[PDB]
Structure formats: structure tokens, C-alpha cells
């Protein structure tokens, strides 16, 4: 991850959390970065590429 | 004869364009003096409507954003493509 | 690709055409030449 201040913030926002808990995959980190949109991060959540602790 | 044009311009932006899609909603930037009734009338006579809600608030553009929902039978796709 | 590396001579390209224009006159009529 790089520049993913915004994606930690946005991914946390869609799963309604304080940002410590939300998890992002190391392998598919590039594909997580190609989000930017609130309906885009929903697909990533369904994939399991973004999860919630 | 002491009245004003209401609409200064339509605002087009990401959120403005999305409103057209969602529920036939145009959004305008209207004069700082602009009252609600005159917006309802003006949109009627520039787009053959009826309006099913007007609500208005400030913007740092100074000109007052006016969020105007329109009737179903209208079609907001062709007539937002006529502006 | 090609095993030859020269393909901008600017030629070879002219050589192929040049032989072609010459041969067809001997082979065939175009101004009352003999036809082979």
C-alpha cells in the first residue's frame, strides 16, 4: 500500500469502524488501491479482500 | 416593475448530475434574493414541469443552491440534455 | 521477424519493383512488343 490513507478512511467508512480494525490484503493491494468509489469497495468486501476485525 | 430572473445558472457537478439520474432532480444556482415560489414558476416556464419539492441553501459561490425535484412524466434525461 | 537485419536500404524495396516492370514488357504486349 501507498497513498492508502484515503482507502483506509473510505474502507473503514463503508464498514463503519474506527480504522484500526479494517483489514486490507497484502497480495491484492494494487487492486484495493484501484477503488476510490463507495460501490467499488463493496465489491472488494464481498470478495473478502477487505475484511473487518 | 421590480423583480429578478431567479435562475442565474444551473449547477452541473458530480452530485448535481447524479441527482438527475436518481429521482428527476435538477439543481440550480439562483439569486441571493430568490424566494421559493419564483423558482417553482421559472422552472415550469423553462422546462414545462411541475416541481415536486423546492429547497434552498447557501454555497461559498454566494449564489444560493436550489435543489428542485420534478415530476416523473417529465423525463429529466432529455431535458437535462436540452441544457 | 527476419534473420536479415537490413530492410531499410532505403532499397531492397525498389529492386523488386524494378525487375518486375522490365520483365512484363518482354513477356507481354503493351506497345506492339513481342509476346512470349
Amino acid at each position: 500500500m501507498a497513498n492508502l490513507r484515503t482507502q483506509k478512511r473510505l474502507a473503514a467508512s463503508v464498514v463503519g469502524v474506527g480504522k484500526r480494525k479494517v483489514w486490507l490484503d497484502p497480495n491484492e493491494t494494487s487492486e484495493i488501491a484501484q477503488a476510490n468509489s463507495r460501490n467499488a469497495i463493496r465489491k472488494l468486501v464481498k470478495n473478502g479482500t477487505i475484511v473487518k476485525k | 416593475l421590480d423583480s429578478y430572473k431567479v435562475i442565474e445558472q444551473p449547477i452541473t457537478s458530480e452530485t448535481a448530475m447524479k441527482k438527475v439520474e436518481d429521482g428527476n432532480i435538477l439543481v440550480f444556482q439562483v439569486s441571493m434574493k430568490a424566494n421559493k415560489y419564483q423558482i417553482k414558476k421559472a422552472v415550469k416556464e423553462l422546462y414545462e414541469v411541475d416541481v415536486l419539492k423546492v429547497n434552498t441553501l447557501v454555497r461559498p459561490n454566494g449564489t444560493k443552491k436550489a435543489y428542485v425535484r420534478l415530476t416523473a412524466d417529465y423525463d429529466a434525461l432529455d431535458i437535462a440534455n436540452r441544457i | 521477424e527476419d534473420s536479415p537485419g537490413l530492410k531499410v536500404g532505403p532499397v531492397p524495396v525498389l529492386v523488386m519493383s524494378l525487375l518486375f516492370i522490365a520483365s512484363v514488357f518482354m513477356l507481354h504486349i503493351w506497345g506492339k512488343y513481342t509476346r512470349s
Partner: protein, 69 residues
């Protein structure tokens, strides 16, 4: 006749001119915003300020007529 300022405009009566003015204003309101466009255009500047310049003429005639009675 073929347009659109100034000799055609300044001596015209006047209901016709007002009707034309609101539909020339509709060209510019159709071409707003944005829809400005890319432009400027000089036509957008000119017809915006032709609305101004000949709203001087209509209000001027009313003012000068009111000082003849």
C-alpha cells in the same frame, strides 16, 4: 433584417423586439452552464450585453415618453 444591431434595433417598435430579446436570451440560457461550452463565444458576450444595451433602449423609451406627458 439580416440580424441584429444597431439601426434595425434602435428605432424598432418594440413588442417584437421584447419577444425576440427573450428568445435570444433563451439561446444563451440553453447555452448556460456549462454549456459554456467551450466558448467564450463573442456571441455569448455580445448577446448578454445586447440584452443589457437594448434593455437600456426599452427603459429609455418609457422614461422619455413619460417626460412628454
Amino acid at each position: 433584417m439580416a440580424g441584429v444591431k444597431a439601426y434595425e434595433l434602435r428605432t424598432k417598435s418594440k413588442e417584437q423586439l421584447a419577444s425576440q430579446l427573450v428568445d435570444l436570451k433563451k439561446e444563451l440560457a440553453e447555452l448556460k452552464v456549462q454549456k459554456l461550452s467551450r466558448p467564450s463565444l463573442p456571441k455569448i458576450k455580445t448577446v448578454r450585453k445586447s440584452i443589457a444595451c437594448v434593455l437600456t433602449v426599452i427603459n429609455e423609451q418609457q422614461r422619455e415618453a413619460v417626460r412628454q406627458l
